[PDB]
Amino acid sequence: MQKARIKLASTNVRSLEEVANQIKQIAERTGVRMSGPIPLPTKRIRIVTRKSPDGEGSATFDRWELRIHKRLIDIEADERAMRQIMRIRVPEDVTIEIELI
């Protein structure tokens, strides 16, 4: 109970699904319910710039862009699983945050 809430957020999309399915399976193997990964809106940061150092020539621009995929998981609290999700060993380009309600 107290329904922990975990929030993953990373820029590589693939390397997120694997930690998601780890959490899903760990929950399943033991006895606990869970709300599947709820996709939250992507946050894409965009930066428009000119292209030439000097000021001569026509004006042509760039569009750099960086996308950040998020998720959200709701799960109960059993120490058999509350612990089981501690040896999960996230990758280095992912963020995780845990908190109960």
């Binding site: 820029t11 930066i47 760039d62 569009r63 750099w64 862009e65 960086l66």
Partner: peptide, 9 residues
Amino acid sequence: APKLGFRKY
């Protein structure tokens, strides 16, 4: 930029 992570789509 392409080492900061950005890409041009």
